[PDB]
Design a binder for this molecule. Structure first.
Ligand SMILES: [Cl-]
Ligand SMILES: [Cl-]
Ligand SMILES: [Cl-]
Ligand SMILES: [Cl-]
Ligand SMILES: [Cl-]
Ligand SMILES: [Cl-]
Ligand code: NA
Length: 129
C-alpha cells in the first residue's frame, strides 16, 4: 500500500508514535517519506547482505528474520515480510523498539540526513488528527 501523507500520519498517531521517545509525529512521517516514499512494500538490499523492509526500512541484520541474513538477530520477533503489510502495526511496533535502543531516530539514515533539524511539522500540516 502506498499511503498518502495525512493517511499515514493518522495511522502512526493511532498506533502511538506521536511523541514516542520524544519524537513528534512529523519526524515519523518525514522518515517514512524518505525511507520508502510511503510504500509499505519497499525493499532495499544492503552491501552486507541484509535487506531493509517496509515503510520504515527496518533492517534484517538486527530486527526481523528473512532467512537470508546469516548471523543476524530478530529483535522484533517477526518475519521481515510482516513489515510489508498494508497494516503498519508490525512496522510501528518494531520502530518503537529501534528508537528505544540508544541512538533514537538516528537509526534511520534518511531521517538523520533529511529530517533531523528541519521543520518536520510541515509533514503533518493540513492533516486532520
Ligand atoms: Cl492522505
Ligand atoms: Cl508527500
Ligand atoms: Cl511534528
Ligand atoms: Cl520468522
Ligand atoms: Cl494501518
Ligand atoms: Cl533521542
Ligand atoms: Na535477522
Amino acid at each position: 500500500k502506498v499511503f498518502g501523507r495525512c493517511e499515514l500520519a493518522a495511522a502512526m498517531k493511532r498506533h502511538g508514535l506521536d511523541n514516542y521517545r520524544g519524537y513528534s509525529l512529523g519526524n515519523w512521517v518525514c522518515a517514512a517519506k524518505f525511507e520508502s516514499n510511503f510504500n509499505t512494500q519497499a525493499t532495499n538490499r544492503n552491501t552486507d547482505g541484509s535487506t531493509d523492509y517496509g515503510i520504515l526500512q527496518i533492517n534484517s541484520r538486527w530486527w526481523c528474520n528473512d532467512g537470508r541474513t546469516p548471523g543476524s538477530r530478530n529483535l522484533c520477533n517477526i518475519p521481515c515480510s510482516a513489515l510489508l503489510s498494508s497494516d503498519i502495526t508490525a512496522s510501528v511496533n518494531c520502530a518503537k523498539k529501534i528508537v528505544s535502543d540508544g541512538n533514537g531516530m538516528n537509526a534511520w539514515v534518511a531521517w538523520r540526513n533529511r529530517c533531523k533539524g528541519t521543520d518536520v511539522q510541515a509533514w503533518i500540516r493540513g492533516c486532520r488528527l
